[PDB]
């Protein structure tokens, strides 16, 4: 089994069955088996949401390079009122999340169309609803690609947000700024903490961003610890 650090010893709890296991639990978080099962659902859900997000942020910068992803909501004209969009979004997400969770709670209970009992999802593993019209390659191989791709995406998002707080531009603009002066755009080249001095990158995010007349508090993640 490939390990996060060659020569390391994987923790007992990680015998390896979950796709993308690399014996990485330095603090032993998923020591409890049920806890590991939950964390496993969290990892997949986080990765899939992040994978869609990272892609969207990049696309919404190739198509509309003007609107900044961080302040996109305040820079875009919603076809519907936020209250109405948020209301629908809440009920929509609430429904899918409830059925999604019920499966994790009691496996194989929500695996059927409630409106049309004729429709019923085939038996499936938790975390994998069953929507697999096309699977290009071994399921486990694609599972590892999904978790590896997802883990990379989740890290990329934090990078998108932090870069958007240190600089005031999106991922593509920031990367170009790096490609222009590679040895003078790194975080080290913009922030240094010496035993006596404290140079921290300026927060390019207004503490509060007004939205449709409602100033929305937008804090720079731990601006005090940079």
User: Which stretches of the chain bind other proteins, using CB under 8 A?
Assistant: 5-8, 11-13, 28-32, 34-35, 182-184, 186, 188-190, 192, 194-200, 223-225
For residue 82, the partner it binds in ligand CLA, other proteins, none, with Cβ less than 5 to 8 A by kind, is none
Does 211 engage in binding with ligand CLA (CB under 6 A)?
A: no
CB 35 to ligand CLA: min, Å: 7
Nearest residue (CB) to other proteins, 91 versus 188: 188
Nearer to ligand CLA, 38 or 80 (CB): 38
Scanning the chain, the segments in alpha helix (DSSP H) are 33-62, 72-75, 82-105, 139-166, 171-180
Contact between residue 39 and residue 51 where contact means Cβ atoms under 8 Å apart: no
Q: What is the DSSP string of 199-217?
A: E-----S-SEEEETTEEEE
Residue 176 CA to residue 39 CA, distance in Å, equals: 36
74-91 per-residue burial string, b: 16 or more CB within 10 A, e: under 16: eeeeeeeeeeeeeeeeee
Q: Which of residues 80-109 bind ligand CLA (CB under 6 A)?
A: none
Residues 6+ apart with CB under 8 A from 131: none
Residue 164 found at the interface with ligand CLA (CB under 6 A): no
Closest CB 52 distance from ligand CLA, rounded Å: 14
Q: Which does 177 bind (CB under 5 to 8 A by kind): ligand CLA, other proteins, none?
A: ligand CLA
């Amino acid at each position: 089994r490939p390990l996060w650090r060659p020569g390391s010893a994987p923790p007992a709890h990680l015998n390896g069955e979950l796709p993308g296991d690399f014996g990485f639990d330095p603090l032993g978080l998923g020591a409890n088996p049920e806890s590991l099962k939950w964390f496993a659902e969290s990892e997949r859900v986080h990765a899939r949401w992040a994978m869609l997000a990272v892609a969207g942020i990049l696309v919404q910068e190739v198509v509309k390079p003007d609107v900044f992803w961080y302040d996109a909501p305040t820079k875009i004209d919603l076809p519907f009122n936020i209250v109405g969009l948020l209301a629908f979004e809440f009920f929509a997400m609430h429904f899918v999340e409830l059925k999604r969770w019920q499966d994790f709670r009691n496996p194989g209970s929500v695996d059927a169309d409630p409106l049309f009992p004729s429709n019923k999802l085939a038996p499936h593993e938790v975390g994998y609803p069953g929507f697999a019209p096309f699977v290009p390659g071994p399921m486990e191989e694609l599972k590892v690609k999904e978790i590896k791709n997802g883990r990379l995406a989740m890290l990329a998002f934090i990078g998108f947000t932090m870069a958007a707080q240190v600089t005031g531009k999106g991922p593509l603009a920031a990367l170009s700024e790096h490609l222009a002066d590679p040895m003078g755009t790194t975080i080290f080249s913009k922030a240094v903490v010496v035993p006596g001095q404290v140079v921290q990158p300026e927060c390019k995010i207004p503490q509060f961003t007004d939205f449709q007349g409602t100033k929305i508090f937008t804090p720079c993640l731990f601006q005090g610890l940079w």
